[PDB]
Amino acid sequence: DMLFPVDNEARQIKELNGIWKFKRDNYYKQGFEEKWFEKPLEDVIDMPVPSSYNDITTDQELRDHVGWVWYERKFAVPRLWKDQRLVLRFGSVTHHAVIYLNGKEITRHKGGFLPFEADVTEMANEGENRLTVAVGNILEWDCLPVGHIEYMEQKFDFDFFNYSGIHRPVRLYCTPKEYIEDISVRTTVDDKDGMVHYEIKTNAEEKFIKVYIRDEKNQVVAESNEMKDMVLVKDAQLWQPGSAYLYKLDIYFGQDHYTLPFGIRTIQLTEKQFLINGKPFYFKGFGKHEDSDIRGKGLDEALNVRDCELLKWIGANSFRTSHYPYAEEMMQMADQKGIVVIDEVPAVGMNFGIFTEDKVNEKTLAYHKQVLKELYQRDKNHPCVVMWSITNEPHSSEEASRNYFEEVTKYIRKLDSERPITGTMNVDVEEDKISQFFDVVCINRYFGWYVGAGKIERIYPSLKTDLIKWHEKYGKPVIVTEYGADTIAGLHKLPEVIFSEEYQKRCIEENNKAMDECDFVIGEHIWAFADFMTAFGLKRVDGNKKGIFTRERQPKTAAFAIRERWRKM
Amino acid sequence: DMLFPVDNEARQIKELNGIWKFKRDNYYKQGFEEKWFEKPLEDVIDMPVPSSYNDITTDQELRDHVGWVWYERKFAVPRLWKDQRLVLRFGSVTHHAVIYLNGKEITRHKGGFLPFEADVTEMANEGENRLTVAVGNILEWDCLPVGHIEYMEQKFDFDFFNYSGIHRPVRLYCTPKEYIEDISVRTTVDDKDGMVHYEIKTNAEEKFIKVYIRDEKNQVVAESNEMKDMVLVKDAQLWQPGSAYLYKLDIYFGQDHYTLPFGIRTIQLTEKQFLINGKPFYFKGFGKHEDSDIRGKGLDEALNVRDCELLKWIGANSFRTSHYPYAEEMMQMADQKGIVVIDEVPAVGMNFGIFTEDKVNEKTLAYHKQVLKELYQRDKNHPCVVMWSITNEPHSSEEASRNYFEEVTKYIRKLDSERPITGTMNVDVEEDKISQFFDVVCINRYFGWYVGAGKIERIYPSLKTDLIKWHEKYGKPVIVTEYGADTIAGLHKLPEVIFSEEYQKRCIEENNKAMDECDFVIGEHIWAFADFMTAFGLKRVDGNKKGIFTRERQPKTAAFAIRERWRKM
Ligand SMILES: [Ca+2]
Numbered sequence A, B: 001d002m003l004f005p006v007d008n009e010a011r012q013i014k015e016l017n018g019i020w021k022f023k024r025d026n027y028y029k030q031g032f033e034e035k036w037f038e039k040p041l042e043d044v045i046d047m048p049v050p051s052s053y054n055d056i057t058t059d060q061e062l063r064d065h066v067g068w069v070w071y072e073r074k075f076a077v078p079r080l081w082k083d084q085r086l087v088l089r090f091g092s093v094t095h096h097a098v099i100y101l102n103g104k105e106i107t108r109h110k111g112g113f114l115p116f117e118a119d120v121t122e123m124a125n126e127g128e129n130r131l132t133v134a135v136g137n138i139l140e141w142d143c144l145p146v147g148h149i150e151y152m153e154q155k156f157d158f159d160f161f162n163y164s165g166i167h168r169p170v171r172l173y174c175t176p177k178e179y180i181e182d183i184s185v186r187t188t189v190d191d192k193d194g195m196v197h198y199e200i201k202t203n204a205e206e207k208f209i210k211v212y213i214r215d216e217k218n219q220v221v222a223e224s225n226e227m228k229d230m231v232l233v234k235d236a237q238l239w240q241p242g243s244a245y246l247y248k249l250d251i252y253f254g255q256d257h258y259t260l261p262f263g264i265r266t267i268q269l270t271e272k273q274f275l276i277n278g279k280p281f282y283f284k285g286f287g288k289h290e291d292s293d294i295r296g297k298g299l300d301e302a303l304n305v306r307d308c309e310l311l312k313w314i315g316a317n318s319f320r321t322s323h324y325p326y327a328e329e330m331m332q333m334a335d336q337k338g339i340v341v342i343d344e345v346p347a348v349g350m351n352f353g354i355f356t357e358d359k360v361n362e363k364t365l366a367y368h369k370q371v372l373k374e375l376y377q378r379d380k381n382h383p384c385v386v387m388w389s390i391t392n393e394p395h396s397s398e399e400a401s402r403n404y405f406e407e408v409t410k411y412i413r414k415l416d417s418e419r420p421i422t423g424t425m426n427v428d429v430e431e432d433k434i435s436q437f438f439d440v441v442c443i444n445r446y447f448g449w450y451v452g453a454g455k456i457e458r459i460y461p462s463l464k465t466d467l468i469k470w471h472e473k474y475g476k477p478v479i480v481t482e483y484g485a486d487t488i489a490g491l492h493k494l495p496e497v498i499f500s501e502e503y504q505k506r507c508i509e510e511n512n513k514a515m516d517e518c519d520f521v522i523g524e525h526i527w528a529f530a531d532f533m534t535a536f537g538l539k540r541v542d543g544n545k546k547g548i549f550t551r552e553r554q555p556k557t558a559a560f561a562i563r564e565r566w567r568k569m
């Protein structure tokens, strides 16, 4: 159960963000061994929430910390909340969490990009309470993303910096004691009329319920007293790429009230095309990252609006939540703005034998299924999500990866029968062993950068040849999910050279020429949207510089050429 | 009454931030004349709150908008708030506001940097309500900051971009119907003993009250049943620069409860020293701004923590709120971190005859006193505030300005008899006509930049001479409140040139040599803390580049030489 918290006459949200008190372990698990949670934290600094902690201070030891840190603040339960159900919700804690309330452990969570909560109805006191949160950043072979510890040094083979902290809002909220627990909505369209199938779960299934479907002007277009039903919406306003329309499932249950936005739209994959509402859709966009200056991966809604303005300005129609689920506020924004989304779990870093019993094994596999279940439960009702990505660049040349990903793909297909399934490729087409389980083949190709760096004339023939091989081996439509080139803003050269602004434009141009000659390509996603931070390395100039925009969300030269192309499509 | 809202067993806060709907006027006052507030806004975009609106979109017409824009969202009143007093608070609206609730005007406000509120107990409905806010950015001769309209173009003489929007949190909060309205605290010290003078004002003064003073471990150290009292704090932990201690005035009144943090510390001025708790204090720090990428002047608490970390790293002990009051969050942070603050009113831009019947006149004067009253009411109880600055660089060579600022200084002295009063100078010392009214003389001087650009060897003789003149004319201690040089990060040259990193360092050094030879100098504030945005001009390379740090809060070369000086001082 993970309905996004709401405010109305019956439910209320208390934000617990702001400035917390903060302290890091000075040796491994110092805070657990010394039971720091038993009393208020001492010798602390201020830390903002939501935000990563790595980039806030001037202290390299905190930036490079491996292990656990400790957050604490106080919150109040109002007298007016006397007989309500009380829930403490964490949008995320990266990567591992132990939650304490007034010195007592109340829940734990594993995985840094999905929300979790704890019912504290019978444990919070009226008035002041103390909330203590332990935050661990260690990744092992059974975490997603994958990593491992060497002797303590953290190892991993994904790009982005392993930021840690409380990256999403913390919320204490209240509901009545009999209440709506979960909602699932599915839609179909028969010519001009839409059919809304819904299922509502409550903790008193025998009690009366009233369910409205309201349109965008909030007028009732359908009505029912069933917990599960199938209601017709005549002349349905469809949710379309670039023109969102959102209905509302408005539910009254006893004293409870919940309103759920949703969209009516169909997805159908053909030979060679990706149909949305029966019309072909060509992905134009980026894989993104949750990353900006100072705050690391902290949610920043102002930055989120600026990014959507940028996506609109440049003619993009989609993005992929590259390498982990994003904040729901961004998923909600994509629903409202009509932006098409590929939603991805953090199965990244399964690459360098990786699929062995001592590394990525059945323990990893079972956790991977759990993350997919948690992702599906959070995002199942978003019309913006049109496809699930279950992995980014696994070492899928290994024979052992075949049974691994057949199992993951079949699990996600049972949870959701309506949305296509995918995963992104980096191994050579001849050696790949899993893409036959997918509905769409997604490839990350860096011709002109990681292959034949600087050789502009080799980009077009190399990509076209590889594209044709992927189509011929699997017979499915293809998206190029990553391609591009590192580019230092202000570095100009004539003739162009790698890292120059001119080279990034030409590299992308030549890849685009290959894709334009292939009738089976259904998308191009440039890597990356914006410069972002990476673990330190000699190929990373203060992070990954493949951004079309700088980290401060201003365009490099190539942005203007991309805009001309995407806007005339 | 402007007590900062609090959460406890009796009072509750609902934040109304997030993503609002937004639309600008297409001609002057269009929304007022078409009565847009009467129905939900149509043809809208998303706009984050808190944030400026100017740097969010890709649209030049909005960035440079002159006039009014319109914000709207919905909010809920829960059933559980049924019998409470309901208050809508705006931390600020820049510059002018008209607030509508369910299509009816409920308040207005002039002034972009101080909070205001509206009692909505009788007008808000249970459940859903519609909040509409018109936001105007026009500055006239009786506004602060000062500006004027020409033919529609906005003119002004201050040097920072005229960002507009809802820069600080919007809060709906509840209290009991009989409640604590205002609190004032003054402190004296007697050897090791504090005396806390307090005065509590309520909604029903004949009822009984309980007042505790609590230390930082929450332990009662004094107690009383009076609304107005002095209570002794023996072995009182003093609030010290760089080592803060905050007691809490904990007040119970009927069903109401309010806890006010405060500090015990004294201020005294001699003709050469600024004494805090009897010890000389030398100001080391910066005038700042509320400015960052994307969000303009929007509150960003993660940015505030990073700034305070950088102030600590560089050995700064103070800042001035150039040129307007900052968010209360930043004032609380200064209270907790032991940072000393010069608190400044937005009386900036009274420069180019300025003090004439048609420009800065009796209306400007009366408004100037009003903003000082409002600033005092908000910040009176902050130990971090050691001095009020009533103006920045007025054209105080005009004879007419004498009576103007005698009025202003008399007025603020009536509100606050303990804190020193000042205002910053740019006119020639021989021409000034007001600084005799101040307790400390503050001068903005840019020898090596605006006077004798590039002539390093003339900086030290020029500032020493000017300093001695200011001291000779007024016989008061002197703070140099601004000095420095524009500096493009990455610009290096040997020998150094203006705009280079090396020149900024040498220019500050030579100015510091002059100050080190003047015993009556009690502070040095470099301009600026961080690069910030200005109105467009040929001297402003994408804004003001006098930052010691970049706009993204990283140090230029001069930061490390400043740190060496300030950390060994
Ligand atoms: Ca969230």
Ligand SMILES: [Ca+2]
Binding pocket: B091, B092, B168, B169, B327, B328, B329
């Ligand atoms: Ca505020």
